[PDB]
Design a protein around this ligand. Structure first.
Ligand code: SF4
Ligand code: F3S
Length: 106
């Protein structure tokens, strides 16, 4: 499974959903998650993220390990997103800020 981590929060470009063959991205107010049972690890979305927030599960940085289980839980409650849309409005002010998890909205 591929995992979305911290830098997506408050950027949410959605470029990643274009390339997904199985549509396994689920949408929250300011973050996207990948559903781990649905992902086929084709790895096509990781190059398409401008925030470089997507990682193969087995390459999630040590300090972002929490995001693996967060993707799994929030995927069960958020709605499927299958079309790109515009980035959040201030997305590049926040691209690259660290510690954005304290800003996640359910
Ligand atoms: S690795 Fe492939 S199947 Fe998984 S979210 Fe990315 S594009 Fe979709
Ligand atoms: S910022 Fe987030 S919405 Fe997709 S393009 Fe990157 S994982």
């Amino acid at each position: 499974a591929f995992v979305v981590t911290d830098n997506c929060i408050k950027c949410k470009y959605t470029d990643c959903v274009e390339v997904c063959p199985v549509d396994c991205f689920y949408e929250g107010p300011n973050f996207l998650v990948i559903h781990p049972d649905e992902c086929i690890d084709c790895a096509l979305c990781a190059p398409e993220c401008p925030a470089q927030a997507i990682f193969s599960e087995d390459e999630v940085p040590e300090d972002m390990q929490e995001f693996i289980q967060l993707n799994a839980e929030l995927a069960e409650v958020w709605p499927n997103i299958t079309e790109k849309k515009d980035p959040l409005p201030d997305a590049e002010d926040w691209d690259g800020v660290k510690g954005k998890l304290q800003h996640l909205e359910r």
